[PDB]
Amino acid sequence: QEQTYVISAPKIFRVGASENIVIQVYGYTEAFDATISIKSYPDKKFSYSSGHVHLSSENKFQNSAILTIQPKQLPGGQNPVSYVYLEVVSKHFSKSKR
Amino acid sequence: SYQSINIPVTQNMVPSSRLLVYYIVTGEQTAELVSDSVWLNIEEKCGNQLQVHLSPDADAYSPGQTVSLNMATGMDSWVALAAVDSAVYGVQRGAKKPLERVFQFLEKSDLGCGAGGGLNNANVFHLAGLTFLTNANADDSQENDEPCKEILYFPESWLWEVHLVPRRKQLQFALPDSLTTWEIQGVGISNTGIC
Amino acid sequence: YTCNEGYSLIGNPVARCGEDLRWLVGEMHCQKIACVLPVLMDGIQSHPQ
Amino acid sequence: EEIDHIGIISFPDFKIPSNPRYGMWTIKAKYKEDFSTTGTAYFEVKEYVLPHFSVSIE
Amino acid sequence: SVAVYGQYGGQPCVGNAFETQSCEPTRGCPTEEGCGERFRCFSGQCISKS
């Protein structure tokens, strides 16, 4: 289990806030790219924001995306959105958390 | 041994910032995320460094005296001004100045609680106000948003206005006829924030 | 979007690159941040015009 | 309601009603459409005359 | 593959059925997920902490 990652994020996303999401990976030497994405929940269909991030020893395999949830893109109405998927996708891993 | 965190405490850090340090160690075969954090108390300071003063400085003025006022700033700014008589606050025992607590109120935005540390990596991140996705055998789903609450002419008012200060401005105006200490207070605003 | 100095953006500030490969825009417009002489009863003269 | 252009929302002057209930009034502020962001302030309405001097009891 | 199966005591095909080449990979090696809140057995299997 040498190849590993951490994506770290605010405990709670503020709507309309510009939120800076940072990623570190370990046990990698070939430079590779990942995308960190904010997607509708549970269906993951609509994407509120996405950030391509490149990882290399040139970055010491560290980077961040600035991602935001513009308030009109939420469906709104009587039931406001309580939860949203944060996602990361790469050649090596894919994960999402509510 | 490791490079220290040698960094400028830039203006964005005021009034408070939190430092979290972390690594993953692969162990023999199983990774572990190791982290620690500390609350860093920062000097309360404005980004505009805005200052306001009476250019004809005097210990006391006479009623109706014409005066000049200067607003000076490190950058171009809006400023609101207002004047209020001190007997007004004298009316109510324990009256509050409306711009009191502004930094402590801004601090209520901070998602963390406690001064740092934690029972665990997950606990460290949660108390730091973060969450994390990792395969390194830890998850923040162990914890929840508990209510953590640990401790770390004779007008009454005039000059109620807003002005642009293109780095500098000068105003000229007449005092009222009342006798008192007038408290003149103002708030600078720009894309650099409040002062 | 953001409007020039002395302006502000009205409507939804946001545009999106749609799957049509073209910009959707939020019906937005830049209002100038200024007053104007209102419809006075008799067009009364303004001295610092 | 008022529209901000500066960060400084100079609302119209609120005329106190012609017969108020005396005591602690409250002002609440919200962004109209899309945020909670609820601000609050209090003010007291009373028949009073300004004190002519402070008494401080220590 | 075998083109003709040996039969009735005829000789089996000699040598290996496979060969290997080095490449430059187009695809990344998938990483393990962790155990998260689950206990991790040394092999990497996960079980309930209970």
Swiss-Prot record, chain B:
This protein's encoding gene: C5
- Sum up the protein's function in the record's words: Precursor of the C5a anaphylatoxin and complement C5b components of the complement pathways, which consist in a cascade of proteins that leads to phagocytosis and breakdown of pathogens and signaling that strengthens the adaptive immune system. Activated downstream of classical, alternative, lectin and GZMK complement pathways.
Q: What domain of life does the UniProt record list for this protein's source?
A: Eukaryota
Could you tell me which cysteines form disulfide bridges?
46-195, 113-148
Summarize the disease involvement recorded for this protein. Answer: Complement component 5 deficiency: A rare defect of the complement classical pathway associated with susceptibility to severe recurrent infections, predominantly by Neisseria gonorrhoeae or Neisseria meningitidis. An association study of C5 haplotypes and genotypes in individuals with chronic hepatitis C virus infection shows that individuals homozygous for the C5_1 haplotype have a significantly higher stage of liver fibrosis than individuals carrying at least 1 other allele.
Posttranslational mods: C5 precursor is first processed by the removal of 4 basic residues, forming two chains, beta and alpha, linked by a disulfide bond. During activation of the complement systems, the alpha chain is cleaved into C5a and C5b by the C5 convertase: C5b stays linked to the beta chain, while C5a is released in the plasma. The alpha chain is cleaved by the serine protease complement C2b component of the C5 convertase to generate C5a and C5b following activation by the classical, lectin and GZMK complement systems.
Query: What name does UniProt use for this protein?
Result: Complement C5
User: What broad taxonomic lineage does this protein's source fall under?
Assistant: Eukaryota, Metazoa, Chordata, Craniata, Vertebrata
| Compartment(s) | Secreted
What subunit structure does UniProt give? In absence of complement activation, the C5 precursor is first processed by the removal of 4 basic residues, forming two chains, beta and alpha, linked by a disulfide bond.
From Swiss-Prot, chain E:
UniProt's post-translational modification comment states:
C-, N- and O-glycosylated. O-glycosylated with core 1 or possibly core 8 glycans.
Name the domain of life this protein comes from.
Eukaryota
Q: State its location(s).
A: Secreted; Target cell membrane
Disulfide bridge positions per record: 35-46
**Record: disease:** Complement component 7 deficiency: A rare defect of the complement classical pathway associated with susceptibility to severe recurrent infections, predominantly by Neisseria gonorrhoeae or Neisseria meningitidis.
Subunit structure, per the record?
Monomer or dimer; as a C5b-7 complex it can also form multimeric rosettes. Component of the membrane attack complex (MAC), composed of complement C5b, C6, C7, C8A, C8B, C8G and multiple copies of the pore-forming subunit C9.
Q: So what does this one do?
A: Component of the membrane attack complex (MAC), a multiprotein complex activated by the complement cascade, which inserts into a target cell membrane and forms a pore, leading to target cell membrane rupture and cell lysis. The MAC is initiated by proteolytic cleavage of C5 into complement C5b in response to the classical, alternative, lectin and GZMK complement pathways. The complement pathways consist in a cascade of proteins that leads to phagocytosis and breakdown of pathogens and signaling that strengthens the adaptive immune system. C7 serves as a membrane anchor.
Family named by the database record? Belongs to the complement C6/C7/C8/C9 family.
Q: What is this protein called?
A: Complement component C7
The scientific name of the source species is Homo sapiens
